[PDB]
Structures are given as structure tokens and as C-alpha cells.
Write a protein that binds this ligand. Structure first.
Ligand SMILES: O=C(O)[C@H]1CN(c2ncnc3[nH]c4cc(F)ccc4c23)CCO1
Length: 167
């Protein structure tokens, strides 16, 4: 038993809700919140900008130190950093950004990072400003992640389409 509430169960291990991940993160304090990161951990907009704003820019400060030490992530890769006031940990995961021409096949590699964590609150990778089809992202999530994932979808309209078209 865990504290996630109001989710629709899609599969054995994947759940979904119309929610603002920032507000869901502040209420659940999950062990892991996933950020829709880029390779530079520049949290300017989308989910990343919202999560970072909710940390009063502490996420960005920590991220800049991480990059200065380690260099950029790989597309499809991840790193674990602090969850600040939102979660114990933040798993920064880089999905491919279609608006940069990145290979959508890397989306599966991106979701594989979730399997290193037993339970996660997450957005749909490569959705929103990353330009991928959220219905495809949900399919890859379901077919790749084996650990327990609670997907927060900000847009109510989108959420209804994802549920209604789910196979
Ligand atoms: O923007 C993207 O990268 C993806 C995923 N994204 C989200 N998904 C779940 N919760 C979200 N809270 C937000 C607050 C914001 F200010 C901006 C985006 C979100 C958001 C929105 C749709 O497309």
C-alpha cells in the first residue's frame, strides 16, 4: 500500500491521473519524482521549469554543479539528484526531443531508467514541449517499465484521450 490517490489503473504496474506533477509531488512526497530533463539539466520550461520553480531554483543550482563535475547526460540517460521539497529524490531522465530531431527509438532507453526504482511519480517522457506523441509515449512506458509508475498528466483533455485510446 502506498499514498498515491485517485489514479486509474492501466496495467499491473502503470497508473495514471490528471494532475499537476508539482502539486502531486508536494502532497505525496514520493520517494522518486521524475523530471523531463535535457542533457544540460537546464530546467527552463515544461515539466522541468515547473519542478525547478517549485524548488525556488535549488534544483537548478544543484544541477549546474552536477554538470560542471560530470558533463552532460546522454539522450536516453538519467541521473539521480535531490528531490528538494518535492520528493526524496529526483530522477532526471532525458527523453528524445523531437523538436531537436532526436531519434524517437531512444524513448525506450529513457523509460528503462525507471526500472532502477521500485515506485515513481512521473510525467510522460518526450511529451509536451519535447514534441513526441503522448499516446506513443504511454505505449512505450507500459511496454518498458516493470516497476510501479504513477503518471501525472497535466492537461485534462489529453488525459481523457490517453485513457479512452488505451489498448
Ligand atoms: O510539458 C511537457 O514537457 C509535457 C508534460 N507536461 C506536464 N506533465 C505533467 N505535469 C505537468 N505540470 C506542468 C507544469 C508546467 F508549468 C508545464 C508542464 C507541466 C506538466 C505538460 C505536457 O507536456
Amino acid at each position: 500500500v502506498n499514498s498515491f490517490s485517485g489514479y486509474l489503473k492501466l496495467t499491473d504496474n502503470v497508473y495514471i491521473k490528471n494532475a499537476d506533477i508539482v502539486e502531486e509531488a508536494k502532497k505525496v512526497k514520493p520517494t522518486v519524482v521524475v523530471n523531463a530533463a535535457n542533457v544540460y539539466l537546464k530546467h527552463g520550461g515544461g515539466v522541468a521549469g515547473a519542478l525547478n520553480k517549485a524548488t525556488n531554483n535549488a534544483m537548478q543550482v544543484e544541477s549546474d554543479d552536477y554538470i560542471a563535475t560530470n558533463g552532460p547526460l546522454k539522450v536516453g540517460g538519467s541521473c539521480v539528484l535531490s528531490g528538494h521539497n518535492l520528493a526524496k529524490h529526483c530522477l532526471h531522465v532525458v527523453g528524445p526531443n523531437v523538436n531537436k530531431g532526436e531519434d524517437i527509438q531512444l524513448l525506450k532507453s529513457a523509460y528503462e531508467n525507471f526500472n532502477q526504482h521500485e515506485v515513481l511519480l512521473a510525467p510522460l517522457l518526450s511529451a509536451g514541449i519535447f514534441g513526441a506523441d503522448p499516446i506513443h509515449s504511454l505505449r512505450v512506458c507500459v511496454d518498458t517499465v516493470r516497476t510501479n509508475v504513477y503518471l501525472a498528466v497535466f492537461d485534462k483533455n489529453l488525459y481523457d484521450k490517453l485513457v479512452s485510446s488505451f489498448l
